[PDB]
Design an enzyme around this catalytic site. Structure first.
Site: not given
Ligand SMILES: [Mg+2]
Ligand SMILES: [Zn+2]
Length: 325
Positions: A79, A83, A117, A228, A280
């Site tokens: 993160h 990303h 985000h 995302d 996964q």
């Molecule tokens: Mg997040």
């Molecule tokens: Zn994210």
């Protein structure tokens, strides 16, 4: 409490020019920003200019905003800044392919929301924060990190010379902040399950209506989820390398849980890596595939994302069969 970019940093971005070769590539869904790290800030500027126009934001303010946002992402395995730009690029591709379905306010708000985000993510999940009563969980009862990410976004806009939205009328200003808040909160996967189920029913029954604000909010929410999770829509080698980063972050959280006397879920246990392939598979069947399937039904042009996701699901199945290369 917020980090601020240096003059050399934003001025360098202002003078940055994107290689002609990438102009064609950046338009495609499968584009991987990976090989061009020094160009990430510039790539975002380029996308904003192509989608919103070169006059949408004051260039100087946009550059300060971008470089300060980068400085407020931490050096965590997944993160992070990379990303953020990856998610923003997926949004760019979605918007470019469905341009007129969204307002100018929505496009600028969404590209910015995507870049911001995961601001100040520390490498810990909402599960961790709430399980161990972190101060953030007390302040934000649900969608903990997401509410923090939005707070961080507003904090950057409040920095001197960083408010790229100040030129909007008071009405549009309030509207864009709401678009951003809703979009960032939507990245809480806990909310995705109900949102996708709702959208699927609205689509199948034919009640989905894009001039209905609550419906628009939900569609935008699904777009945020799709962006995302877009690592699962890249070419297999890219998707596989990104998984490495995702788990590196998970395993570190699991290590902290053990220190607190709690055994982590298998996904966050570095001593249970053999369970990853099936894990996964479970994520693709329960989250990724349904997400892109519904997104494609609502926005046909996004079909490439679903096709790529399906291809990677097949790759994980190959791994489970012991056919990995
Ligand atoms: Mg997040
Ligand atoms: Zn994210």
């Amino acid at each position: 409490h917020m980090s601020i970019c240096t003059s050399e940093e934003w001025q360098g971005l202002m003078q940055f020019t994107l290689p002609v070769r990438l102009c064609k590539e950046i338009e495609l869904f499968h584009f991987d920003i990976g090989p061009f790290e020094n160009m990430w800030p510039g790539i975002f500027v380029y996308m904003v200019h192509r989608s919103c126009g070169t006059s949408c934001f004051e260039l100087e303010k946009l550059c300060r905003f971008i470089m300060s946002v980068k400085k407020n992402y931490r050096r965590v395995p997944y993160h992070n800044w990379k990303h953020a730009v990856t998610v923003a690029h997926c949004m760019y591709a979605i918007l470019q392919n469905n341009h007129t379905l969204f307002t100018d306010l929505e496009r600028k708000g969404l590209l910015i929301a995507c870049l911001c985000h995961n601001l100040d993510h520390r490498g810990f999940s909402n599960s961790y924060l709430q399980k161990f009563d972190h101060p953030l969980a007390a302040l934000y009862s649900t969608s903990t990190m997401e509410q923090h990410h939005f707070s961080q976004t507003v904090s950057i806009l409040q920095l001197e010379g960083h408010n790229i939205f100040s030129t909007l009328s008071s009405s549009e200003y309030e509207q864009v902040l709401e678009i951003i808040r809703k979009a960032i909160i939507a990245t809480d996967l806990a909310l995705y399950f109900g949102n996708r189920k709702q959208l699927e029913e609205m689509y199948q029954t034919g009640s989905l209506n894009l001039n209905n604000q609550s419906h628009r909010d939900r569609v935008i929410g699904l777009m945020m989820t799709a962006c995302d999770l877009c690592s699962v829509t890249k070419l297999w080698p890219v998707t596989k390398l990104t998984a490495n980063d995702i788990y590196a972050e998970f395993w570190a959280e699991g290590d902290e849980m053990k220190k607190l006397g709690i055994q982590p879920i298998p996904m966050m246990d570095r001593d249970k890596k053999d369970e990853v392939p099936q894990g996964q598979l479970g994520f693709y069947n329960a989250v990724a595939i349904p997400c892109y399937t519904t997104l494609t039904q609502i926005l046909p042009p996004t079909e490439p994302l679903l096709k790529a996701c399906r291809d990677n699901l097949s790759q994980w199945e190959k791994v489970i069969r012991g056919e990995e290369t």
